[PDB]
Design an enzyme around this catalytic site. Structure first.
Site, PDB file in Angstrom:
ATOM      1  N   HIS B  46       0.804  -1.210   0.000  1.00 39.51           N
ATOM      2  CA  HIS B  46       0.000   0.000   0.000  1.00 39.51           C
ATOM      3  C   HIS B  46       0.834   1.256   0.000  1.00 39.51           C
ATOM      4  O   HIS B  46       1.958   1.253   0.482  1.00 39.51           O
ATOM      5  CB  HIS B  46      -0.902   0.128   1.253  1.00 39.51           C
ATOM      6  CG  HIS B  46      -1.435  -1.176   1.759  1.00 39.51           C
ATOM      7  ND1 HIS B  46      -0.940  -1.696   2.935  1.00 39.51           N
ATOM      8  CD2 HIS B  46      -2.352  -2.064   1.267  1.00 39.51           C
ATOM      9  CE1 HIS B  46      -1.532  -2.872   3.103  1.00 39.51           C
ATOM     10  NE2 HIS B  46      -2.401  -3.108   2.136  1.00 39.51           N
ATOM     11  N   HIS B  48       1.115   4.592   2.026  1.00 39.64           N
ATOM     12  CA  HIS B  48       0.761   5.204   3.328  1.00 39.64           C
ATOM     13  C   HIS B  48       0.871   6.691   3.244  1.00 39.64           C
ATOM     14  O   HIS B  48       1.563   7.228   2.360  1.00 39.64           O
ATOM     15  CB  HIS B  48       1.650   4.604   4.393  1.00 39.64           C
ATOM     16  CG  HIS B  48       1.279   3.186   4.713  1.00 39.64           C
ATOM     17  ND1 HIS B  48       0.937   2.787   5.985  1.00 39.64           N
ATOM     18  CD2 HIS B  48       1.278   2.077   3.957  1.00 39.64           C
ATOM     19  CE1 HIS B  48       0.679   1.482   5.945  1.00 39.64           C
ATOM     20  NE2 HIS B  48       0.864   1.024   4.721  1.00 39.64           N
ATOM     21  N   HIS B  63      -2.848   4.071   5.940  1.00 40.80           N
ATOM     22  CA  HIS B  63      -2.975   4.060   4.461  1.00 40.80           C
ATOM     23  C   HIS B  63      -3.375   5.431   3.958  1.00 40.80           C
ATOM     24  O   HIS B  63      -4.164   6.132   4.595  1.00 40.80           O
ATOM     25  CB  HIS B  63      -3.994   3.016   4.028  1.00 40.80           C
ATOM     26  CG  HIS B  63      -3.593   1.643   4.392  1.00 40.80           C
ATOM     27  ND1 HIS B  63      -4.444   0.591   4.084  1.00 40.80           N
ATOM     28  CD2 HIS B  63      -2.574   1.127   5.117  1.00 40.80           C
ATOM     29  CE1 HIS B  63      -3.893  -0.496   4.633  1.00 40.80           C
ATOM     30  NE2 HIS B  63      -2.726  -0.225   5.159  1.00 40.80           N
ATOM     31  N   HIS B  71     -10.906   0.511   4.053  1.00 38.92           N
ATOM     32  CA  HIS B  71      -9.945  -0.307   3.327  1.00 38.92           C
ATOM     33  C   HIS B  71     -10.623  -1.269   2.391  1.00 38.92           C
ATOM     34  O   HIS B  71     -11.644  -1.914   2.716  1.00 38.92           O
ATOM     35  CB  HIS B  71      -9.091  -1.046   4.356  1.00 38.92           C
ATOM     36  CG  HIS B  71      -8.066  -1.918   3.781  1.00 38.92           C
ATOM     37  ND1 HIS B  71      -6.899  -1.389   3.241  1.00 38.92           N
ATOM     38  CD2 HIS B  71      -8.013  -3.248   3.576  1.00 38.92           C
ATOM     39  CE1 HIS B  71      -6.174  -2.399   2.772  1.00 38.92           C
ATOM     40  NE2 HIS B  71      -6.852  -3.524   2.912  1.00 38.92           N
ATOM     41  N   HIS B  80      -9.206   2.660   0.162  1.00 36.93           N
ATOM     42  CA  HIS B  80      -8.290   3.782   0.278  1.00 36.93           C
ATOM     43  C   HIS B  80      -7.587   4.031  -1.035  1.00 36.93           C
ATOM     44  O   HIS B  80      -7.289   3.085  -1.807  1.00 36.93           O
ATOM     45  CB  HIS B  80      -7.288   3.442   1.336  1.00 36.93           C
ATOM     46  CG  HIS B  80      -7.871   3.134   2.667  1.00 36.93           C
ATOM     47  ND1 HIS B  80      -7.255   2.197   3.470  1.00 36.93           N
ATOM     48  CD2 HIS B  80      -8.898   3.656   3.366  1.00 36.93           C
ATOM     49  CE1 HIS B  80      -7.922   2.167   4.615  1.00 36.93           C
ATOM     50  NE2 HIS B  80      -8.904   3.065   4.584  1.00 36.93           N
ATOM     51  N   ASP B  83      -4.596   1.681  -1.516  1.00 32.99           N
ATOM     52  CA  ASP B  83      -4.821   0.254  -1.464  1.00 32.99           C
ATOM     53  C   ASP B  83      -4.435  -0.447  -2.768  1.00 32.99           C
ATOM     54  O   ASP B  83      -5.237  -0.541  -3.667  1.00 32.99           O
ATOM     55  CB  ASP B  83      -6.253  -0.069  -1.086  1.00 32.99           C
ATOM     56  CG  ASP B  83      -6.589   0.265   0.333  1.00 32.99           C
ATOM     57  OD1 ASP B  83      -5.626   0.423   1.187  1.00 32.99           O
ATOM     58  OD2 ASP B  83      -7.757   0.316   0.689  1.00 32.99           O
ATOM     59  N   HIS B 120       4.155  -5.509   3.471  1.00 27.42           N
ATOM     60  CA  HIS B 120       3.811  -5.978   4.806  1.00 27.42           C
ATOM     61  C   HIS B 120       4.176  -7.434   5.047  1.00 27.42           C
ATOM     62  O   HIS B 120       4.401  -8.227   4.167  1.00 27.42           O
ATOM     63  CB  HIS B 120       2.310  -5.833   5.054  1.00 27.42           C
ATOM     64  CG  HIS B 120       1.870  -4.461   5.234  1.00 27.42           C
ATOM     65  ND1 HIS B 120       1.783  -3.884   6.496  1.00 27.42           N
ATOM     66  CD2 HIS B 120       1.486  -3.508   4.343  1.00 27.42           C
ATOM     67  CE1 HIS B 120       1.379  -2.613   6.363  1.00 27.42           C
ATOM     68  NE2 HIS B 120       1.195  -2.355   5.060  1.00 27.42           N
ATOM     69  N   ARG B 143       5.357  -3.905   9.049  1.00 29.16           N
ATOM     70  CA  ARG B 143       5.903  -3.291   7.827  1.00 29.16           C
ATOM     71  C   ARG B 143       7.303  -3.799   7.569  1.00 29.16           C
ATOM     72  O   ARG B 143       8.240  -3.462   8.350  1.00 29.16           O
ATOM     73  CB  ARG B 143       5.881  -1.764   8.068  1.00 29.16           C
ATOM     74  CG  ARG B 143       4.482  -1.292   8.310  1.00 29.16           C
ATOM     75  CD  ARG B 143       4.328   0.196   8.630  1.00 29.16           C
ATOM     76  NE  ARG B 143       2.954   0.468   9.028  1.00 29.16           N
ATOM     77  CZ  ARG B 143       2.403   1.653   9.066  1.00 29.16           C
ATOM     78  NH1 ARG B 143       3.089   2.753   8.775  1.00 29.16           N
ATOM     79  NH2 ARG B 143       1.125   1.758   9.388  1.00 29.16           N
TER      80      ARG B 143
HETATM   81 CU   LIG Z   1       0.390  -0.772   4.167  1.00 30.59          CU
HETATM   82 ZN   LIG Z   2      -6.192   0.539   3.054  1.00 26.84          ZN
END
Ligand SMILES: [Cu+2]
Ligand SMILES: [Zn+2]
Ligand SMILES: [Cu+2]
Ligand SMILES: [Zn+2]
Lengths: 153, 153
Positions: B46, B48, B63, B71, B80, B83, B120, B143
């Site tokens: 994603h 952020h 995010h 999400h 998001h 995403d 992630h 992360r």
């Molecule tokens: Cu993420």
């Molecule tokens: Zn998200």
């Protein structure tokens, strides 16, 4: 964006953190933080065009120069947007940075977000060195640490 | 601009390079590259909100979510802007990344330049999991690696 941040790292001992704040659209940008691991003395300090660290700090390209000017110091009219002069380290290897600059921005065509901040091996001569390179890089030498400038909370 | 890049770095090494290309501002963004050092399987992927790596990838915040949505996966209307779903690593620990997305951008209110790309620990459930966290983080866990998205040449 009103705030930005950059984590400076490279292949050697030089590391730092630099913060940016711009209160107003088209107002000055406060630049502050610390860099350690440096040799005593001046070290060139600029925003470079690309936020590309693919192959290290070399990937960031030349000084950020959207108006096609010659290299200078931050208090010169004739400067690159990215020309923030020098930071100065003590015998302890630390440079405390405290800059205000009215040419860089955190939005618009002078925006530095997504570009690279670089701290150099040698002093920047602010374009007054009287060789050709002075007019392009300030003779500041190799890139000791850098990072991409990011939007901050 | 019309190109961006991101160097992902984390413990493993989890390391990767991701390129971004957007042919026109009203157009989709091609995302491509490689990440190595991953465990076999899906890893959430994603943008952020903050391009802040002050204290590591944690500093990048949640995010990127300029529209205040829940999400989801990349193909979902309810997502998001950040995403991007999952990347998938082979037994060799490498994920080949090849994405096109119409919601991220390299300019405008949905611009991701100056923000942080994260890969992630765990799979992103694309908002379809059996709990409240699914609709916030996808349950993708810690992360492993991140970098600030920069403008590329
Ligand atoms: Cu993420
Ligand atoms: Zn998200
Ligand atoms: Cu420089
Ligand atoms: Zn310059």
């Amino acid at each position: 964006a009103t705030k930005a941040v950059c984590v400076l790292k490279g292949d050697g001992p030089v590391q730092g953190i630099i913060n940016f704040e711009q209160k107003e659209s088209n107002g000055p940008v406060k630049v502050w933080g610390s860099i350690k691991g440096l040799t005593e003395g001046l070290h060139g300090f600029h925003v470079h065009e690309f936020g590309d660290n693919t192959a290290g700090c070399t990937s960031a390209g030349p000084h950020f120069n959207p108006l096609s000017r010659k290299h200078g110091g931050p208090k010169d009219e004739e400067r690159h947007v990215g020309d923030l002069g020098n930071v100065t380290a003590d015998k302890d290897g630390v440079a405390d940075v405290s800059i205000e600059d009215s040419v860089i921005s955190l939005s618009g065509d002078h925006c530095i977000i997504g570009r690279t901040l670089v701290v150099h091996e040698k002093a920047d001569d602010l374009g007054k060195g009287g060789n050709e390179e002075s007019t392009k890089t300030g003779n500041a030498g190799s890139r000791l640490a850098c990072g991409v400038i990011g939007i901050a909370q």
